Amino acid sequence: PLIVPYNLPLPGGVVPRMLITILGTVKPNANRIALDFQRGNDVAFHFNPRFNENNRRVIVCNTKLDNNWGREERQSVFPFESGKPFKIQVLVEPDHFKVAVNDAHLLQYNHRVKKLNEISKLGISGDIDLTSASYTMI
Ligand SMILES: Cc1ccc(S[C@@H]2O[C@H](CO)[C@H](O)[C@H](n3cc(-c4c(F)c(F)c(N=[N+]=[N-])c(F)c4F)nn3)[C@H]2O)cc1
């Protein structure tokens, strides 16, 4: 298994048609997962499944610029299940990151950070056993 938190370099940043695939298993009593697409210290796209936010499950997405979080985009559709294997696919499209979980579309996140070629790291953190993290062009 891979170490968590995991640092996946994205050489030269991201580009439309780049597909990132994360495979893992959610831990028993998981609390949180995070994917952090980073441009240096900024987080261009934070994808944060929360398993117990006021006793509800929700996905919070946001961007961090100069150490400040912006406006959250929340998705109450929650495809993750504690204890179970998952696949997250993040497809970079021209105007947004497109996320599918277990082969079902989940959400799109419009690019706030526009220098895609500078979004050169993906951090994977939280309450998972991480099996694989990779990218390819489609
Ligand atoms: C005015 C105001 C602004 C923000 C807040 S809350 C803030 O909200 C933003 C999204 O808007 C982010 O979710 C922030 N976050 C999450 C994590 C994180 C982590 F640190 C971990 F270590 C994780 N896993 N492991 N281990 C893991 F999954 C994580 F998500 N880091 N930062 C969160 O603090 C409250 C009030």
Curated annotation (Swiss-Prot):
Keywords: Acetylation, Cytoplasm, Differentiation, Disulfide bond, IgE-binding protein, Immunity, Innate immunity, Lectin, mRNA processing, mRNA splicing, Nucleus, Phosphoprotein, Repeat, Secreted, Spliceosome. The modification Phosphoserine is found at S76. It comes from the Eukaryota. A major expression is found in the colonic epithelium. It is also abundant in the activated macrophages. Expressed in fetal membranes. One of its GO terms (biological process) is negative regulation of T cell receptor signaling pathway. Residues 6-136 form the Galectin domain. A beta-D-galactoside binds at W69, G70, R71, E72, E73, R74, Q75. One of its GO terms (cellular component) is plasma membrane. One of its GO terms (molecular function) is molecular condensate scaffold activity. The keyword ATP-binding does not apply. A motif (Nuclear export signal) lies at residues 114-129. It is found in: Cytoplasm; Nucleus; Secreted. Probably forms homo- or heterodimers. Interacts with DMBT1. Interacts with CD6 and ALCAM. Forms a complex with the ITGA3, ITGB1 and CSPG4. Interacts with LGALS3BP, LYPD3, ZFTRAF1 and UACA. Interacts with TRIM16; this interaction mediates autophagy of damage endomembranes. Interacts with cargo receptor TMED10; the interaction mediates the translocation from the cytoplasm into the ERGIC (endoplasmic reticulum-Golgi intermediate compartment) and thereby secretion. Galactose-specific lectin which binds IgE. May mediate with the alpha-3, beta-1 integrin the stimulation by CSPG4 of endothelial cells migration. Together with DMBT1, required for terminal differentiation of columnar epithelial cells during early embryogenesis. In the nucleus: acts as a pre-mRNA splicing factor. Involved in acute inflammatory responses including neutrophil activation and adhesion, chemoattraction of monocytes macrophages, opsonization of apoptotic neutrophils, and activation of mast cells. This is Galectin-3. The gene is LGALS3.
